[PDB]
Design a protein around this ligand. Structure first.
Ligand SMILES: [Mg+2]
Ligand SMILES: [Mg+2]
Lengths: 103, 103
């Protein structure tokens, strides 16, 4: 359905340990928030030098645009987002419905 | 394996028709380039106002980091990239190996 993509840069002084702690917390929102169905992440390993300072990507899966909105309004999201966003330099969010060249 | 993510903003004066033409061309690289295995895209429909001016996302799937490198070096990529990049304002690329909280 709808993929919720967040790209991030962790601020100076955020440890690798705090990053893995934060990522486990973000992923836990699957469990805490009904509409969020799955969570995957990655550290950038590109070679093109086009990452624009972002180092990580987080993708969460939803069944609809309305489900993403419910997630954003959910008090567990609002609480955790303060924690997570507090450790970021850069953030970028895009939501899309995966489309392909299909018949 | 490795997901190759490109975020884009189309420059002023690129028509919706030229965009769909360009997207069909990018997607065709699946066919032209062995290492590229699948292609999906989306227009941003986020509500958070965090998209940083990017409007589209393109995700291509590869089997390895080496396969992405082969794609970048492939002459069909080099030719088409001039065309596609010529119509962009903003571009951002990240490659990642999808990771999850798993046992
Ligand atoms: Mg859930
Ligand atoms: Mg191919």
């Amino acid at each position: 359905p709808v993929k919720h993509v967040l790209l991030a840069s962790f601020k100076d002084g955020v440890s690798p340990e705090k990053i893995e702690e934060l990522i486990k917390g973000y992923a836990n929102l699957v469990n805490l928030i009904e509409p969020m169905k799955a969570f995957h992440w990655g550290k950038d390993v590109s070679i093109e030098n086009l990452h624009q300072g972002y180092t990580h990507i987080f993708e969460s899966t939803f069944e609809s645009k309305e489900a993403v909105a419910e997630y954003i309004a959910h008090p567990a999201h609002v609480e955790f987002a303060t924690i997570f966003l507090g450790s970021l330099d850069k953030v970028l969010v895009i939501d899309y419905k995966p489309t392909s060249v299909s018949l």
